Scaffold this active site. Structure first.
Site, PDB file in Angstrom:
ATOM      1  N   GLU A 132       4.316  68.404 102.466  1.00 16.45           N
ATOM      2  CA  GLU A 132       4.682  68.878 103.627  1.00 16.45           C
ATOM      3  C   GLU A 132       6.132  68.927 103.847  1.00 16.45           C
ATOM      4  O   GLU A 132       6.804  69.637 104.802  1.00 16.45           O
ATOM      5  CB  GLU A 132       4.016  68.180 104.783  1.00 16.45           C
ATOM      6  CG  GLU A 132       4.647  66.571 104.729  1.00 16.45           C
ATOM      7  CD  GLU A 132       4.070  65.806 105.827  1.00 16.45           C
ATOM      8  OE1 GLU A 132       3.387  66.339 106.915  1.00 16.45           O
ATOM      9  OE2 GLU A 132       3.876  64.557 105.806  1.00 16.45           O
ATOM     10  N   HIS A 143       3.608  53.794 101.958  1.00 10.40           N
ATOM     11  CA  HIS A 143       4.609  54.527 101.461  1.00 10.40           C
ATOM     12  C   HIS A 143       5.297  54.081 100.444  1.00 10.40           C
ATOM     13  O   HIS A 143       5.462  54.708  99.118  1.00 10.40           O
ATOM     14  CB  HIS A 143       5.593  54.875 102.482  1.00 10.40           C
ATOM     15  CG  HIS A 143       5.148  55.888 103.609  1.00 10.40           C
ATOM     16  ND1 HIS A 143       4.499  57.175 103.293  1.00 10.40           N
ATOM     17  CD2 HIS A 143       5.341  55.653 105.061  1.00 10.40           C
ATOM     18  CE1 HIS A 143       4.327  57.655 104.568  1.00 10.40           C
ATOM     19  NE2 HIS A 143       4.649  56.911 105.622  1.00 10.40           N
ATOM     20  N   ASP A 168       9.571  57.718  97.267  1.00 11.84           N
ATOM     21  CA  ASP A 168       8.264  58.579  97.827  1.00 11.84           C
ATOM     22  C   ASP A 168       9.068  59.002  99.009  1.00 11.84           C
ATOM     23  O   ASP A 168       9.236  58.438 100.177  1.00 11.84           O
ATOM     24  CB  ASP A 168       7.180  57.895  98.116  1.00 11.84           C
ATOM     25  CG  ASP A 168       6.194  58.504  98.916  1.00 11.84           C
ATOM     26  OD1 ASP A 168       5.431  59.443  98.629  1.00 11.84           O
ATOM     27  OD2 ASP A 168       6.106  58.147 100.151  1.00 11.84           O
ATOM     28  N   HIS A 192     -14.148  67.724  81.467  1.00 20.06           N
ATOM     29  CA  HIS A 192     -12.865  68.875  81.528  1.00 20.06           C
ATOM     30  C   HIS A 192     -13.056  69.691  80.410  1.00 20.06           C
ATOM     31  O   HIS A 192     -13.054  69.400  79.191  1.00 20.06           O
ATOM     32  CB  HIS A 192     -11.517  67.813  81.390  1.00 20.06           C
ATOM     33  CG  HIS A 192     -11.448  66.931  82.655  1.00 20.06           C
ATOM     34  ND1 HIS A 192     -12.309  65.825  82.755  1.00 20.06           N
ATOM     35  CD2 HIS A 192     -10.452  66.749  83.517  1.00 20.06           C
ATOM     36  CE1 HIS A 192     -11.780  65.371  83.757  1.00 20.06           C
ATOM     37  NE2 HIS A 192     -10.758  65.802  84.359  1.00 20.06           N
ATOM     38  N   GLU A 202       8.762  61.430  94.203  1.00 16.67           N
ATOM     39  CA  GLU A 202       7.437  62.015  94.748  1.00 16.67           C
ATOM     40  C   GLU A 202       7.606  62.421  96.083  1.00 16.67           C
ATOM     41  O   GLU A 202       7.747  61.415  96.916  1.00 16.67           O
ATOM     42  CB  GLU A 202       6.261  61.009  94.379  1.00 16.67           C
ATOM     43  CG  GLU A 202       5.203  61.201  95.369  1.00 16.67           C
ATOM     44  CD  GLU A 202       4.167  62.254  94.759  1.00 16.67           C
ATOM     45  OE1 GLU A 202       3.289  62.800  95.706  1.00 16.67           O
ATOM     46  OE2 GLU A 202       3.980  62.511  93.753  1.00 16.67           O
TER      47      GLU A 202
END
Lengths: 117, 1056
Positions: B492, B707, B9, B572, B488
């Site tokens: 940003e 994280h 990550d 959905h 992942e």
């Protein structure tokens, strides 16, 4: 418990100048109620959105918020001598049961009048 | 040797990693190791400037002052060589003795009188020192330089039109009479002169002094002095600026070049046109060949090809909308879609000068246009460009072009490669197809090689990927090569500082918008279980958005029965099993009764949509008359999508960083993957979904530890797990019975949530009040107690998570603060600084040097300051003068000297000034008699090479400190962000050293995970180590392992 829609119709009386500051006041009043759920009745500053427009706001008439809002509307209408507000009231059951083509008009017809100014 | 997937990550200041031991069947079974690695993000934090900027600016200032001093030194040597000062008019150092201090006056009077060697020398040195501004032609284009140019050009015109004859005479008379000063002040560019004017003045001075009989007007002197006044080094060359950017990567011999180029602009245009598809209500389609042919030449013919303008050309007929265009925004079709900036820049330049009939096509060849673009992008002076395009185009055209045109910005392909591509692309054939057809495009090793700075042109991204590389390499060293790597990256990563600031702004906007919506939900439903989640507000918002009507039937829906369970569902439109799409564009509010016969069909395939059944027409009319945005209505009625392609685009992230990382890691790492891509870039949305549904509630945590949590999730997202999830969702949309109750949404394995929570936070979830299992014993006993069912929950790798902070042992940096102060009165603890009146505050003036000796001035300034409510810039906006005893006005004031406190400093400007300390680069720690002594080491000390003697004492002003000698035992040196242990009377403190206050001798340490419950925002402040029991320094690697005390032998030096 029972949800009431307040149909308010904003019209222009023609008698006097519009007073853009009054447009700002009305825009603030209407926009106080708008949130992202019913953002589609965002109050603009031009006549096109403020003149001759029906907006139906959803209230919960087991909460004293409807009355304060309608009182503010009536006070502004009394102030503005050249803008006229009409208020009605409909139960949300009958409002939603109407056919969505001109629902605000039909609900106004089917609703107890509240204040005409 | 373990078969495991590594989940990463990545974000702008953190990389979390997780290890998952999997079956041969790729099903996740064992959580091995997780960690977090945090660093400082590669930008100046407050402003988004780059770290290199501060250093580069100082470098250019250094070079400027150096070259000026050298030029003046050469001028003095030339004066001596040409007799002008004859010998030893110079001092112990090369400066001229008794040089006059009236050079403006002597320069002006040199036109009318033969000067003197001293006066002549002063004039020439003054001209060399102040040689005015040089054009470097069409310079009107840049915020200020425009202002300096306004002043320069104004003064040049005034010199030539109003009869004043030279810069010296005009400067003297106008500036002295009308302003009282010659040289500019504070930012003003009013009195600046161009080099052309000063060269003319120099020539005239030499002529006049030959007339008046000056022994030194030799040809040598004139040649030398003119060359000194005019010469400066060339700006960057074409090949040098090209060496800055990489080779083409398509044709290594040729360079990448020239955005403002017919070939390059045409590449951009054809890429847009070929990729531009139009969606009409219903489905998608690409432009027919006739449509492309129609649009192809319009960017040249018109100024810009507006989207609405394109609608006109095609007779597109509303209910036909452009894809890749936000149609909610009003008058969105005024967007540009294409503008040929270079073609029209050249055309406007010619049109504006009389060489081109406006709206007549530019007849210049594509080759010539490419050449003009490259030339104007590679050279920054008229002469160089003049030569380049003097080869190939007619003189008047080139002169017109040099006016009005400014080019920049290259595009990563060689004009040869783009030349081959754009004929191939014109035929049709999306970019990759043509590129492969022309030149179709693997050396594996164990450890990931360094991140190529060329492919990653961004400092923040480069540091994030580099620290991800360090994490990867450490993990591989410790546990061997991974089976697969899942990735992942934060949204940003790879965004301009402006972009990230704006994203934060709208995130807070949405915070307050949703809080208003929640308040409205509370008002409508006053009696509600706890607080409303996201789906509840969505329920209400869809209710109002759908006209109070279930979208599948049109039957009215009861408000207030909304949270009566099962009465209304969020369906959905496109089934999740076939699209993996749960956007806000694919969610409708339907009745429980009606949404039981849809099955796993799309809305188009359920209302038949192929025979235009009146149920389908009723439904399409219903959705079109709802307050849905255009995108939502488009998605609801897709009809003809690519199932697998759509679910794939919704399943992974295709951003620039993620694609680069997947290709790089796949190419040059060992990674014992089965063979299909072996590297996966998980889409953020789906990862958040998996977190929520696997029991990982978004906690209320300061920890950088979270994280790692995400890193676990991405690591369990495997093809087998995905297909299992898809199967479960499928059986769920068709009403499963394969039982009903015990059909938990497939999890990687049982009690995954609880183990992950204990492993990451060292606490059973929902007990943030609980104490953390700091140690192996505590953690393993907790795992065996609260997860007795799980056999492999404990094993030989389960260690408490300790976040690893990238260290910073750099010994360099700013030597001192920027402003230099008077050091005369330094025996008294004080210094003096010239403070302008515009910046003058009461607490400054109360310490004026001449507060006692200028009582009239003191009282006047004080009273004036009282008025206007102590506003410095406001109070002294009107000129302030001094007054004599007899009431007369005598002389203005611009700035007064102000005393300041100065107990320490750095010597600067030839030991004629003092500046404040900047930032300590090291702290040496000594022990003597079970007490600790901190010697601070600053960067200027490292430069001068002076290993400091004295350690801090709490209150003594700097002089009276404890001198360290061989009776003390030195323990270690502390750089910022080193791991330290302070065993004290109160408690035990462990954390990364951050600051060492010099007024107290105390230190601040960041808690490793920055838990906000500890200290203030995770920082223990003011820890006193003088009287600690233990004070030791530790070491730690990327992964948070190998935490050991380290023992230094000898005190290290400052220089080598």
């Amino acid at each position: 418990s029972m949800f009431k829609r307040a149909i308010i119709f904003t019209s222009f009386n023609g008698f006097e100048k519009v007073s853009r500051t009054e447009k700002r006041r009305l825009a603030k009043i209407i926009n106080a109620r708008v949130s992202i759920i019913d953002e589609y009745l965002r109050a603009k500053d031009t006549n096109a959105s403020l003149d001759g427009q029906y907006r139906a706001f959803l209230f919960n008439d087991e909460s004293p918020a409807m009355t304060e809002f309608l009182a503010k509307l009536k006070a502004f209408a009394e102030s503005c001598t050249g803008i006229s507000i009409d208020a009605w009231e409909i139960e949300e059951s009958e409002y939603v049961r109407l056919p969505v083509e001109r629902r605000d008009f039909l609900a106004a017809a089917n609703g107890k009048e509240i204040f005409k100014i | 040797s373990i078969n495991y997937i590594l989940g990463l990550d990545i974000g702008i200041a953190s990389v979390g990693w997780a290890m998952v031991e999997i079956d041969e069947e790729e099903n996740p079974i064992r959580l091995i190791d997780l960690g977090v690695r945090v660093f400082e993000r590669a930008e100046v934090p407050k402003t988004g400037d780059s770290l290199a900027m501060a250093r580069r600016l100082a470098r250019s200032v250094r070079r400027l002052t150096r070259r000026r001093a050298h030029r003046l030194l050469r001028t003095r040597r030339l004066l001596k060589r040409e007799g002008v000062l004859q010998a030893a008019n110079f001092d112990e150092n090369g400066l001229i003795k008794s040089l006059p201090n009236t050079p403006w006056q002597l320069r002006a009077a040199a036109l009318d009188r033969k000067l003197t060697p001293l006066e002549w020398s002063a004039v020439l040195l003054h001209l060399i020192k102040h040689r005015g501004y040089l054009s470097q032609e069409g310079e009107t284009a840049d915020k200020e330089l425009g202002a300096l140019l306004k002043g320069v050009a104004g003064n040049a015109h005034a010199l030539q039109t109003g009869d004043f004859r030279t810069p010296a005479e005009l400067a003297l008379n106008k500036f002295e009479k009308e302003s009282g000063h010659i040289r500019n002040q504070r930012s003003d560019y009013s009195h600046t002169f161009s080099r052309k004017d000063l060269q003319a003045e120099l020539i005239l001075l030499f002529e006049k002094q030959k007339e008046f009989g000056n022994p030194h007007v030799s040809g040598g002197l004139k040649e030398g002095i003119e060359t000194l006044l005019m010469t400066q080094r060339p700006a960057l060359s074409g090949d040098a600026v090209q060496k800055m950017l990489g080779h083409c990567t398509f044709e290594p011999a040729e360079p990448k070049a020239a955005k403002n180029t017919y070939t390059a602009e045409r590449f951009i245009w054809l890429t847009k046109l070929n990729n531009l598809r139009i969606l009409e209500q219903g489905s998608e389609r690409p432009l027919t060949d006739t449509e492309r042919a129609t649009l192809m030449d319009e960017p040249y013919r018109k100024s810009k090809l507006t989207y609405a303008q394109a609608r006109k050309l095609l007779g597109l007929e509303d209910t036909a909308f452009f894809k890749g265009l936000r149609y909610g925004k009003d008058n969105a079709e005024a967007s540009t879609l294409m503008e040929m900036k270079a073609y029209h820049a050249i055309s406007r330049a010619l049109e504006k000068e009389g060489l081109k009939d406006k709206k007549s096509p530019l007849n210049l060849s594509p080759e010539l246009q490419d050449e003009i673009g490259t030339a104007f992008s590679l050279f920054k002076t008229d002469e160089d460009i003049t030569g380049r395009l003097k080869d190939r185009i007619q003189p008047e055209i080139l002169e017109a072009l040099l006016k009005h045109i400014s080019f920049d910005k290259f595009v990563q392909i060689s004009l040869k490669a783009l030349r081959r591509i754009v004929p191939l692309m014109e035929q049709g054939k999306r970019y990759d197809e043509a590129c492969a057809e022309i030149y179709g495009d693997t050396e594996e090793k164990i450890y990931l090689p360094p991140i190529p700075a060329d492919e990653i042109r961004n400092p923040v991204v480069l540091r994030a990927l580099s620290q991800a590389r360090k994490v990867i390499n450490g993990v591989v060293r410790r546990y061997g090569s991974p089976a697969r790597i899942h990735i992942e990256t934060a949204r940003e990563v790879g965004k301009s500082f402006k972009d990230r600031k704006e994203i934060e702004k709208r995130q807070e906007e949405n915070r307050k918008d949703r809080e208003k919506a929640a308040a409205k939900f509370r008002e409508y439903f006053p009696n509600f279980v706890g607080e409303p989640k996201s789906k509840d507000i969505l329920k209400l918002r869809l209710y109002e958005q759908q006209h109070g009507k279930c979208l599948y039937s049109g039957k009215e829906i009861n408000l207030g029965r909304l949270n009566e369970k099962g009465y209304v569902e969020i369906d959905h439109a496109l089934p999740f099993s076939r699209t993996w799409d749960d956007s806000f564009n694919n969610k409708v509010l339907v009745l429980g009764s009606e949404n039981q016969n849809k099955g796993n069909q799309t809305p188009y395939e359920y209302f038949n949509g192929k025979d235009n059944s009146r149920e389908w027409q009723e439904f399409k009319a219903r959705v079109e008359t709802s307050r849905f945005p255009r995108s939502k209505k488009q998605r609801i009625l897709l009809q003809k999508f690519d199932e697998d392609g759509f679910k794939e685009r919704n399943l992974n992230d295709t951003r620039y960083v993620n694609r680069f990382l997947c290709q790089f890691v796949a190419d040059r790492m060992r990674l014992t993957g089965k063979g299909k891509k072996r590297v996966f870039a998980s889409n953020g949305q789906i990862t958040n979904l998996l977190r929520g549904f696997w029991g990982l509630r978004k906690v209320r945590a300061e920890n950088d530890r979270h994280h790692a949590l995400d890193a676990v999730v991405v690591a369990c997202s495997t093809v087998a797990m995905q297909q299992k999830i898809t199967r479960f969702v499928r059986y769920k949309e068709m009403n499963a019975f394969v039982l009903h109750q015990k059909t938990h949404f497939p999890q990687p394995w049982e009690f995954f949530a609880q183990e992950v929570m204990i492993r990451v936070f060292g606490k059973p979830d929902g007990k943030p009040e609980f104490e953390e299992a700091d140690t192996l014993e505590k953690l393993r006993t907790l795992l065996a107690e609260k997860l007795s069912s799980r056999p492999e929950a404990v094993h030989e790798y389960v260690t408490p998570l300790f976040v690893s902070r990238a260290p910073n042992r750099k010994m360099s940096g700013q030597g001192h603060m920027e402003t230099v102060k008077s050091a005369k009165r330094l025996d008294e603890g004080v210094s003096v600084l010239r403070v302008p009146l515009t910046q003058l505050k009461l607490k400054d003036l109360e310490k004026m040097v001449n507060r006692e000796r200028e009582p009239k001035l003191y009282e006047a300034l004080k009273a004036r300051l009282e008025a206007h409510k102590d506003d410095p810039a406001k109070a002294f906006a009107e000129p302030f003068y001094k007054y004599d005893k007899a009431g007369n006005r005598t002389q203005q004031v611009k700035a007064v000297r102000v005393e300041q406190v100065q107990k320490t400093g750095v010597w600067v400007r030839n030991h004629n000034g003092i500046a404040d300390n900047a930032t300590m680069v090291r702290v040496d720690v000594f022990e003597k008699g079970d007490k600790y002594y901190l010697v601070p080491i600053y960067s200027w000390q490292v430069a001068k090479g002076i290993l400091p003697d004295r350690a801090v004492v709490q209150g003594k002003d700097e002089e009276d400190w404890q001198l360290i000698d061989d009776s003390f035992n030195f323990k270690f040196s502390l750089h910022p962000n080193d791991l330290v242990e302070v065993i004290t009377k109160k408690a035990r403190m462990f954390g990364y050293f951050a600051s060492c206050h010099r007024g107290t001798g105390n230190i601040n340490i960041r808690i490793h995970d920055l838990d906000h419950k500890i200290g203030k925002n995770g920082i223990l402040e003011g820890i006193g180590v003088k009287t600690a029991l233990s004070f030791q320094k530790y070491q730690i690697d990327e992964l948070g392992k190998e935490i050991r005390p380290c023992r230094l032998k000898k005190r290290p030096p400052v220089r080598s």
